[PDB]
Amino acid sequence: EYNAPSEIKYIDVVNTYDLEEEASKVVPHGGFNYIAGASGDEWTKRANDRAWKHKLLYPRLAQDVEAPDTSTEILGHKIKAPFIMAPIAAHGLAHTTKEAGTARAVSEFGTIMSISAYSGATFEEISEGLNGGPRWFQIYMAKDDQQNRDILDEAKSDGATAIILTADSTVSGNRDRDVKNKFVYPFGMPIVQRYLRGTAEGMSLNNIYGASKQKISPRDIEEIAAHSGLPVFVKGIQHPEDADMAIKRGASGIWVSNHGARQLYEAPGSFDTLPAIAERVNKRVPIVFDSGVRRGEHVAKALASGADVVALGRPVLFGLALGGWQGAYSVLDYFQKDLTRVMQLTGSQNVEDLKGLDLFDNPYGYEY
Amino acid sequence: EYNAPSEIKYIDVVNTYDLEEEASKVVPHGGFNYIAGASGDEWTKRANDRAWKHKLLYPRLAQDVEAPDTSTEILGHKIKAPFIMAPIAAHGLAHTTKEAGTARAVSEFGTIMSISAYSGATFEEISEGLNGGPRWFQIYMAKDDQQNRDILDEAKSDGATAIILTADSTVSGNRDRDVKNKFVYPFGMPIVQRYLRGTAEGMSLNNIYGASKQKISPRDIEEIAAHSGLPVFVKGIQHPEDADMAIKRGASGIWVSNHGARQLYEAPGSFDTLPAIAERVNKRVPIVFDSGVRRGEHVAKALASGADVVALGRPVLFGLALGGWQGAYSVLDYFQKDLTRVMQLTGSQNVEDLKGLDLFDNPYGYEY
Ligand SMILES: Cc1cc2nc3c(=O)[nH]c(=O)nc-3n(C[C@H](O)[C@H](O)[C@H](O)COP(=O)(O)O)c2cc1C
Ligand SMILES: Cc1cc2nc3c(=O)[nH]c(=O)nc-3n(C[C@H](O)[C@H](O)[C@H](O)COP(=O)(O)O)c2cc1C
Structure with missing residues (x-):
């Protein structure tokens, strides 16, 4: 019913934008539009991308810099570059090796894998791809407390x-594309099957989101943190008040995101929200930033604006479609090399120097 | 020929401003004016004080807070409240127990003592007051590198x-007060018995700052940062570019200060400089803030604006000025209790919560 790409190969990444059109040629139409699409007419996905032009980098000269070091650390993980993999459902829509292929790329590169609760691969299949590499688990909460305890324990x-x-x-x-395409998952989700009584195959994302917890409160942040004894990030924050609340409720990290514009429509571009959240967090917990990172300049601008790392999403999945783990790896390698150039030209020898950059305010925005 | 006060007692501190007028009816005019005075007509000392009215606290209601905790940690020192003692020369101008008295107050209260290179007490006298309490050493950059090695080893x-x-x-x-008083130190500086070649008493105030390094460079920051094998704070920063330079040169901390307005005249109030510096530092190293902290509200505002801790100066010395005397352990206890009240009224359970406060921008400044 669904013929995902299966080829494994490195790819020569000139830029990540060209990956979208290239992936559209190999991924079945429904699955491709599920990955690529966003809410409404995609104005907020375009805002995620255009937001990068609001704050511009300065080249700096005679900075006594050579062979910048992209390495950093988050929550006691040394990682090769200040980016991690975002949690994304259903990698089997992009490639037959699915989350195991993404996990292999992430672990081979040397950063953190985020596992979606809506993974099409089992923990065992992802663990094989990770080969001991670090992982964070993203919970889409069950309504049943015991199922959350079981999911967290697993x-x-x-x-x-x-x-x-x-x-x-x-x-x-x-998500107008998925509505127009009448898109349903063509395979199961082994980690959350328990609270869908039936199967996630042939279901819309409405009824799967529907089965998850709607009435999430701060108590949920407390209780995940107490049960797991692990640091809890709260993901999807765009308003500084939610960051303050989340920290006061026991969060160990703030994950600034609008879900790649797949959720609320006619909202700001995610990067525009970051400085107000970083100023409110004021160093209390680490900040992960995502939604629209496409270039090394974007990684640099996020760090300059208060993020500790960024999370990568669609570009990595498009690389997976085009080359399996080697194609996903190629995208991670592109971001690391792209950032290294940006560090050299900005006078940045290391990731801490990036955090110290001043940005040029562009009040004209995209058209200039 | 200097009759400092010698009485030891607790004092009922209603506010720290009243401590300045209290003291001078045995408490010598020249030394009092050395402690209290500032550059020019003291407009920038007044600016340090009025700057607190630029950013105002909001009371925050039904915040689910009681028994706030003022404790914090800096460079792995757990301290009772988010303030430390600033490095101040010549405590014997305020009291016969001099730096040993201050050290005993600081150690008994449970925070960090900063020792001025221009202490009138030997390290062994201060050590007796400190009774194993944590201490940081404040240096000036010597022209003679042997003198930098010597004091770093001490x-x-x-x-x-x-x-x-x-x-x-x-x-x-x-410092017009000291000029008009022809003020000379009435005692020596035993720690820096190695620089002044001739006599310490014979050198008034202009010759001692002259025997030290005028030509401080980043390499000085780097060389201290290398010989010391200790974290180096660079103190006196008011411009964000200096904070970025200092960190790139190996500083482990930024100490935002204008030296209590005793140095450059017709400069900003220190608190007005803090947010630009905190934004540029962007979590890379801890920030100590000083110059004008008089109230618990000031400690809260500094933390809300990016400082990790503040340093206290003149109010702790107030064993000296104008009337009948007051300043010590009672002053540290005042600041702790004052801060606890501000924490309760701002909805802050702990020092991290203070770092998340939003402040009201007052564009009308002091006269409102
Ligand atoms: C196909 C797709 C599926 C996603 N599924 C999830 C999910 O299962 N869990 C989650 O927390 N976020 C999910 N997200 C959001 C991502 O974690 C991330 O915020 C987003 O990809 C970032 O935007 P970008 O990829 O355009 O840069 C998904 C995003 C995409 C594109
Ligand atoms: C009497 C006096 C002497 C000082 N001596 C020194 C010094 O030896 N070393 C130094 O780094 N700063 C020195 N300072 C500056 C203090 O460390 C601190 O920045 C200043 O007291 C803060 O301002 P405030 O006390 O008005 O709040 C001195 C300040 C005063 C009032």
Whole structure:
């Protein structure tokens, strides 16, 4: 019923935008539009991308810099570059090796794998791809407390070193592409099957989101943190008040995100929200930033604006479609090399120097 | 020929402003004006004080807070409240127990003592007051590198766990009170018995800042940062570019200060400089803030604006000025209790919560 790409190969990445059109040629139409699409007419996905032009980098000269070092550390994980893999459902829509292929790319590159609760691969299949590499587990909460305890226990037993509480998808965004394509998952989700009584095959993402917890409160952040004894990130924050609340409720990290514009429509581009959240967090917990990172310049601008790392999403999945783990790896390698150039030209010898950059305010925005 | 007060007692501190007028009816005019005075007509000392009215606290209701905890940690020192003692020369101008008295107050209260290179007490006298309490050593950059090696070794032998490189004093401020009083130190500086070649008493104030390094460079920051084997704070920073330079040169901390307005005249109030510096530092190293902290509200505002801790100066010395005397352990206890009240009224359970406060921008400034 669904013929995902299966080829494994490295790819020469000139830029990540060209990956979308290239992946559209190999991924079945429904699955491709599920990955690529966003809410409404995609104005907020375009805002995620255009937001990068609001704050511009300065080249700096005679900075006494050579061979920049992209390495960093988050929550006692040394990682090769200040980016991690975002939790994304259903990698089998992009490639037959699915989450095992993404996990292999992430572990081979040397950063953190985020596992979606809506993975099409089992923990065992992902663990094989990770080969001991670090992993964080993203929970889409069951309504039943005991199922959450069981899901958290499974993830920590698999070796999770943080929990990502995604709270921005209590209902689906208005994803017009998936509505027009009448898109359903063509395979099961082994980690959350328990609270879908039946199977996730042939279900819409409405009824799967529907089966998850709508009435998430701060108590949920407390209780995940107490049960897991792991640091909890709260993912989907765009308003600084939610960051303050999440920290006061026991979060160990803030994950600034609008879900790649797949949720609330006619909202700001995610990067525009970051400085106000970073100023409110004021160093209390680490910040992960995502939603629209496409270039090394974007990684640099996020760090300059208060993020400790960024999370990568669609570009990595498009690489997986085009080359399996080697194609996904190629995208991670592109971001690392792209950032190294940006570090050299900005006078940045290391990731801490990036955090110290001043940005040029562009009040004209995209058209200039 | 200097009759400092010698009485030891607790004092009922209603506010720290009243401590300045209290003291001078045995408490010598010249030394009082050395402690209290500032550059020019003291407009920038007034600016340090009025800057607190630029950013106002909001009371925050039904915040689920009681028994706030003022404890915090800096460079792995757990301290009772988020304030430390600033490095101040010549405590014997305020009281016969001099730096040993201050050290005993600081150690008994449970925070960090900063030792001025221009202490009138030997390290062994201060050590007796400290009774194993944590201490940081404040240096000036010597022209003679042997003198930099010598004082860094003295620091480490004396159990310092950080070095404070004061940079903002390569020459003296235009301190009109000391000029009009023809003020001379009435005692020696035993710690820096190695620089002044001739006599310490014979050198008034302009010759002592002259015997030290005028030509401080980043390499000075780097060299202290290398010989010390201790974290180095660079003290006197008011411009964000200096904070970025200092960190790139190996500083382990930024100490935002204008030296209590005793140095450059017709400069901003210190608190007005803090947010630009905190934004540029962007979590890379801890920030100590000083110059004008008089109230618990000031400690809260500094933390809300990016400082990890504040340093206290003149109010702790107030064993000296204008009337009948007051300043010590009672002053540290005042600041702790005052901060606890502010925490309760702002909805802050702990020092991290203070770092998340939003402040009201007052564009009308002091006269409102
Ligand atoms: C196909 C797809 C599926 C996603 N599924 C999840 C999910 O299972 N869990 C989650 O927390 N976020 C999910 N997200 C959001 C991502 O974690 C991330 O926020 C987003 O991909 C970032 O935007 P970008 O990829 O355009 O840069 C998904 C995003 C995509 C594109
Ligand atoms: C009497 C006096 C002497 C000082 N001596 C020194 C010094 O030896 N070393 C130094 O780094 N700063 C010195 N300072 C500056 C203090 O460390 C601190 O920045 C200042 O007291 C803070 O301002 P405030 O006390 O008005 O709040 C001195 C300040 C005063 C009032």
